[PDB]
Amino acid sequence: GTSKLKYVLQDARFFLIKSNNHENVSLAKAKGVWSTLPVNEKKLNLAFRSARSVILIFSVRESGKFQGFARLSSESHHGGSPIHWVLPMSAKMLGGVFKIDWICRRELPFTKSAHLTNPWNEHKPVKIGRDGQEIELECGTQLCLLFPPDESIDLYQVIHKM
Numbered sequence: 233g234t235s236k237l238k239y240v241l242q243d244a245r246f247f248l249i250k251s252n253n254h255e256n257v258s259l260a261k262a263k264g265v266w267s268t269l270p271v272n273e274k275k276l277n278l279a280f281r282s283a284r285s286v287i288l289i290f291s292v293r294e295s296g297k298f299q300g301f302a303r304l305s306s307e308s309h310h311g312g313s314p315i316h317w318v319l320p321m322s323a324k325m326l327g328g329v330f331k332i333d334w335i336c337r338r339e340l341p342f343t344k345s346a347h348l349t350n351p352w353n354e355h356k357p358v359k360i361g362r363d364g365q366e367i368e369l370e371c372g373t374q375l376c377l378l379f380p381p382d383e384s385i386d387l388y389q390v391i392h393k394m
């Protein structure tokens with residue numbers, strides 16, 4: 233069902249996250265981590281303290297799809313295990329590392345979100361946006377609800393972190 237998912241998304245904030253390569257999304261899916269440039273790191277840390285859930289929605293550039301979505305479980309932190317991101321740019325330019333819990337590891341093609349517009353990006357289609365673009369609550373909730381259910385994930389433990 234979708235009830236626990238709707239509960240996790242209640243009053244959430246949503247951010248579009250863009251990667252030039254699939255390998256970085258695969259690393260994030262395997263390790264439960266994400267890292268971004270300082271400008272976005274500051275926005276996400278502010279958001280994490282402001283809302284019950286902060287949701288990252290991932291898209292690999294030129295793939296025509298979103299690759300899933302995850303909830304921040306921590307602010308960014310430095311000094312952990314190195315992550316061998318594939319960068320376009322040195323690794324020192326990245327901020328710290330956020331821990332994330334995946335909510336959905338399934339893909340969604342952009343063709344399926346063509347009816348969703350993001351007020352925070354001039355009401356352009358939600359697929360359109362820079363890395364770090366915030367997605368308004370209603371649009372972000374509907375986008376997440378369009379993804380295929382991911383039956384491998386149990387949201388019970390996620391709910392307990394809220």
Ligand SMILES: O=c1[nH]c(S)nc2sccc12
Binds near residue numbers: 269
């Ligand atoms: O594609 C990217 N660009 C930047 S600036 N940082 C990262 S961290 C993982 C992927 C990725």
